């Protein structure tokens, strides 16, 4: 995003800064649910080979 968040938690985040935060947050959480499986599939391919 071209506009950074000038403020900090102590000062206080607004609804705009918070809404913009959410994107990154949820992509992170979705990443944990969805991405975990290719890592694990690599462990399993490795195990079978060796």
């Amino acid at each position: 995003i071209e506009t950074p968040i000038t403020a900090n938690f102590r000062e206080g985040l607004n609804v705009l800064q918070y809404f913009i935060s959410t994107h990154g947050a949820r992509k992170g959480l979705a990443d944990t649910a969805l991405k975990t499986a290719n890592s694990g599939y690599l462990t399993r391919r490795l195990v079978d080979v060796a």
Partner: protein
């Protein structure tokens, strides 16, 4: 590379347990292949000592 290397093992019990079980068993059945149970997965399948 890993996936093919695991399927190239001369044990069809390991090949079947990994993936592609239908195809592995047709090619083993047609070859009249004999698995002498040398690897770890093979022994774990028959419930024997590793």
């Amino acid at each position: 590379g890993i996936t093919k290397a695991s399927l190239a093992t001369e044990s069809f019990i390991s090949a079947a347990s990994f993936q592609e079980t239908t195809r592995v068993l047709t090619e083993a059945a047609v070859a009249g292949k004999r698995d002498e149970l040398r690897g770890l997965k093979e022994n774990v399948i028959v419930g024997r000592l590793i």
